[PDB]
Amino acid sequence: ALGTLDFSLLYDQENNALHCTISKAKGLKPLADPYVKLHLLPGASKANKLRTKTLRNTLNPSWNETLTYYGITDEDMIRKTLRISVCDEDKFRHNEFIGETRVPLKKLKPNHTKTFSICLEKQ
To answer: Quick one: which residues bind Ca(2+) 1?
Structure first.
């Protein structure tokens, strides 16, 4: 198993915003310098891309960091999927993919934070 990621998603409907709180991961399996990348599916523009800071020398990182998309409508909630990738930063070399999961936004309710604990998959 590649590891387990904990996170929370909030559709801030009044503000057309999706707040993605990346909390922590447990038992990552690349040592590692973990960081998390977010991509909104149906989405090519690098505006669809958000990313957490990088942590050092940990297989159980705690970012506790919130990343926010704006321009999110109910239609986007129905149509889109949040891709969440955990990667390993190898400075001056090649960054390695660790694991991912995806959350269809239609599973979220407006103004209600939903928390997730997911065992990561490969690509």
So the answer is: 33, 88, 90
Which residue, 29, 35, 91, is CA-closest to 59? 29
Please tell me whether 90 is known to bind a ligand: yes
Query: Which option is the CATH number for 1-123: 2.40.10.500, 2.60.40.150, 3.40.710.10, 2.115.10.20?
Result: 2.60.40.150
Three-state DSSP string of 26-58: ECCCCCCCEEEEEEEECCCCHHHEEECCCCCCC
Which value in Å is the resolution of this experimental model? 2.0
The answer to whether 36 and 87 have CB atoms below 8 angstroms apart is yes
Are the C-beta atoms of residues 87 and 35 closer than 8 Å to each other? yes
Tell the burial category of 30 from Cβ atoms under 10 Å away from its Cβ (0-12, 13-18, 19+): middle
Q: How far is CA 79 from the centre of its chain?
A: 18
* Cβ(22)–Cβ(65) below 8 Å: yes
